[PDB]
A paper describes a structure:
The virion of bacteriophage SU10 has a prolate head with a length of 1430 Å and a diameter of 460 Å, which is formed by the major capsid protein (gp9). The tail is 220 Å long and decorated with six long and six short tail fibers. The tail is attached to one of the vertices of the prolate capsid, where the dodecamer of portal proteins (gp6) replaces a pentamer of capsid proteins. The part of the portal complex protruding from the capsid enables the binding of the dodecamer of adaptor proteins (gp11). A hexamer of nozzle proteins (gp17) is attached to the adaptor complex and enables the binding of six short tail fibers, trimers of short tail fiber protein (gp16). The tail needle, which is formed by three polypeptide chains (gp18), protrudes from the central channel formed by the nozzle proteins. In the SU10 virion, the short tail fibers are tilted towards the capsid and the tail needle protrudes from the tail complex.
In contrast to other short-tailed phages, the tails of Kuraviruses elongate upon cell attachment. After binding to the host, SU10 tail, nozzle proteins, and short fibers re-arrange to form a nozzle that extends the tail.
Author numbering:
A (entry chain EA): 216 to 322
B (entry chain EB): 162 to 322
C (entry chain EC): 162 to 269
Amino acid sequence: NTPFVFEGGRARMEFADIKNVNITTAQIANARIQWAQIDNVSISNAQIQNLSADKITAGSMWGSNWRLTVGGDFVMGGTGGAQLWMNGNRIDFYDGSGALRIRIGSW
Amino acid sequence: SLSQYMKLSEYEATWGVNSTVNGRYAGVKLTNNGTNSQFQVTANKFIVGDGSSGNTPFVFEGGRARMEFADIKNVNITTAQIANARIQWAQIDNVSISNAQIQNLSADKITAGSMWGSNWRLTVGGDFVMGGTGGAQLWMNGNRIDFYDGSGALRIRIGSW
Amino acid sequence: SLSQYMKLSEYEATWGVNSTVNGRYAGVKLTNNGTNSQFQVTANKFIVGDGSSGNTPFVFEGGRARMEFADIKNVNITTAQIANARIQWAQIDNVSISNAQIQNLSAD
């Protein structure tokens, strides 16, 4: 095996153990990390067990039984298929048949 | 031995180079004790130059392996300092981040100071404020839900008056 | 003929010092076939020791490039296992995270 191959300007390595790496550009297919400190990130998909954040700018939000739309509709589901639909004009309570039972706000 | 007190011994085909000048040891000791072949470069600077451009795109210097490019299938790292990092699949046990831009965030628990959509905000104080059509605004917290109209006039209050 | 080692054929200059002890091919084979030169260290341990302290702060051992420090301008990696990682800019197609602490989190 050639588990170090410096070829064509590229240090190919099958394994490495680096105590202290500076990197200018990484292209990492898989990355387990115990303690990161990231000044800026873009991410396509995250799966975070315990997120903490000082400010969250969110487009849409979705839980198992609620959603906050990009438009600002906070919709929560209820027992029996009931639904609170809330936005900056009104709170609507729908029942499990989809019938509006209470409106509070702009009619 | 047509080499310098290094030649090749039986047990250790010691291609030493062992440049000893002013008590600085340099070498290339290809030892092979037949169990561990050790190619010990001893140098303040190990270089791989490319055989084409005289670029030195591997330079180990002063304890530091400098690389112009690398292709590492597996890397343990104790400390990274990465200026730019594209990553296809991360698994991060702990992270601090100063700015994030996440297309699809899933999370089991979100501790949050303030939260801000295009037409809503949940403040650090616990005021959830949604904007509405015409500049209307539902402002709610654990004391009340207030509906303001497009002129900022309170139209409905529910909770503490 | 070269005892401690070498071989210039018209088509390949093999600077191959092939330390073959106990069937461990140690070597360093600088081939040059005039199209590709290859400096093949073959070693259980390619060490770069500093010529100063006898520290070995590059040690290619057992298929693993051990590095006390490194400065890599452009690393492709297939699998990282990073104990601590400061990163100034990242672009992460997928991530699982156990704990995050994010000062400003934009998300679609």
